[model samples]
Structures are given as C-alpha cells and as structure tokens.
Target: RQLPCAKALYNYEGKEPGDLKFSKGDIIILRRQVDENWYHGEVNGIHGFFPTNFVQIIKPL
Candidate 1:
C-alpha cells in the first residue's frame, strides 16, 4: 500500500535532474523539511526535493 504522508496540490515540472516531478493529486512521503519553502520527499519510489507550496498536508510529521 502507498503510505503517503502528504499530497501534491499542483502539477510540477522539475527544472533539474534531482528534482521531483509529480502531477496534481499525487501521493508523497515527506523525508525532511529543509526549510519553510522546501521539503525532501519520495514519490513513485523516487526521492527528491520539491517545493512545499505545491503540496497540501495530509498527515503532519
């Protein structure tokens, strides 16, 4: 089962190779909160950093 701790609220196209590219309504697991604007998360078994503004909180961690 997919254990997503958060959900993407917007579609994002990563500009870099290590960035996480996910569509709206995708599930993500929060790995680290880098700051107020960035978070390290996992989606589709791929780990990368994404903007926090693109996601909504499903479960607080």
Candidate 2:
C-alpha cells in the first residue's frame, strides 16, 4: 500500500541503528505507526521508526 510523505520539522537523533534520524526539511515516506509516540518510515534508503511529533504531512497517500 502507498503511504503519505512527510517533512521533518526537527533534527531527530536516533538512539539505535533501528531508529531513523532526519533533519529539518528532509522528506520521508510514512510506512506505519509503531505507537502514539512513533511511526515507521523510509528515508535515504533506510527504514526505521521516528517520533511522530518530528514530522509534518507534506502529501497524502
């Protein structure tokens, strides 16, 4: 299924390899939500979870 795209609003620092780190203005595709606090997505060929609050929807799926 297709997912919505989002832009990072802040520089999210990932704590582990499984986490996704993104900078402000970076674009990423939202995959799924892990919980209320996090969501899964892909960026720069990397797939991982990032804070939901860090991103803003740029386009609908």
Candidate 3:
C-alpha cells in the first residue's frame, strides 16, 4: 500500500532540515504523515515535510 500524494496549492520555500520546498501545482509523494497538517514527503528520493493543506491528497495510479 502506498500513501497518497499531495498537490501544491501554493508555492513555498524552506531551508530547515526535513523541509520539502515545493512550488504550486507540484505533485508530491507522501511518505508519511507526521502531524495532522503536515506530510513527510519524497521528491525523487529527496525527503522532507510540507503542509497538508498546501497540497491536496492525490492517490497513486
């Protein structure tokens, strides 16, 4: 089973450790959900966290 992905609704920037900086309309693969409003995600194996609200939850095909 795979966790659903998140689509960026707004662009964001990050420099903190474990922060996944993403732009608008980007599809992010969610590796884990740490908090209710955050997703620990992967970008080409690049791991970090992003807001759950920033991205809509999308499923894998």
Candidate 4:
C-alpha cells in the first residue's frame, strides 16, 4: 500500500513530540522551512525533524 502522507507517528516516549502520545494511523504533514536547510514537521503542536525511517517512500525520482 502507498503512504497517504509523508510523516508517520511519534512512538518514542522520550521524544518531545512523542509526549503527545502518537501511534499508527495518526496523520502528520510535512513542512519545509526556507530559513533552514533541513526539513521539519509538527506533531501535536510540537515541531521536530521528521525521521525518514518512520515514513514509507512512494517514489524517490
């Protein structure tokens, strides 16, 4: 199956974003900031670097 979104869910309890208690089926959106070279996203109002391993890539090209 193809991923409906880029980010998955925050499962790490020690993580700031994961403090919101997220799991599978949770919806996350990608937000690229022009001020920074790295890509970032939000979860439960907390922003962090979206882990690539958490998401399934549909296509790279």
In terms of TM-score, which candidate is strongest?
A: 1
lDDT of 1: 0.85
| lDDT for residue 41 in candidate 4, whole number 0-100 | 50
How would you encode candidate 3's per-residue C-alpha lDDT over 1-61 as one tens digit per residue? 7657878899976989978988898878878888787778877778898877888778832
Against the reference, the lDDT scores of all candidates come to 0.85, 0.84, 0.80, 0.45
By TM-score: ranked, best first: 1, 2, 3, 4
Q: Compose the digit string of candidate 4's lDDT tens values, residues 1-61.
A: 4322453534533355433334555555445432433335555666565455554433321
Select the stronger candidate by lDDT from 2 and 4: 2
After best superposition, candidate 3 residue 23: deviation in angstroms? Answer: 0.5
Q: What stretches of model 1 exceed 4 Å from their correct place? A: 1-4
Worst 10 residues of 4 by lDDT: 30-39
Q: Flag regions of model 4 displaced more than 4 Å.
A: 1-10, 13-21, 33-39, 57-61
TM-score between candidate 2 and the true structure: 0.82
lDDT: which is higher, 1 or 3? 1
- Which window of ten consecutive residues has the lowest lDDT sum in model 1? 1-10
- Lowest-sum lDDT 10-residue window in model 2: 52-61
TM for candidate 4 is 0.41
lDDT, candidate 1, 1-61, per-residue tens: 5454788999876778779888999988988889999988888689888998999988756
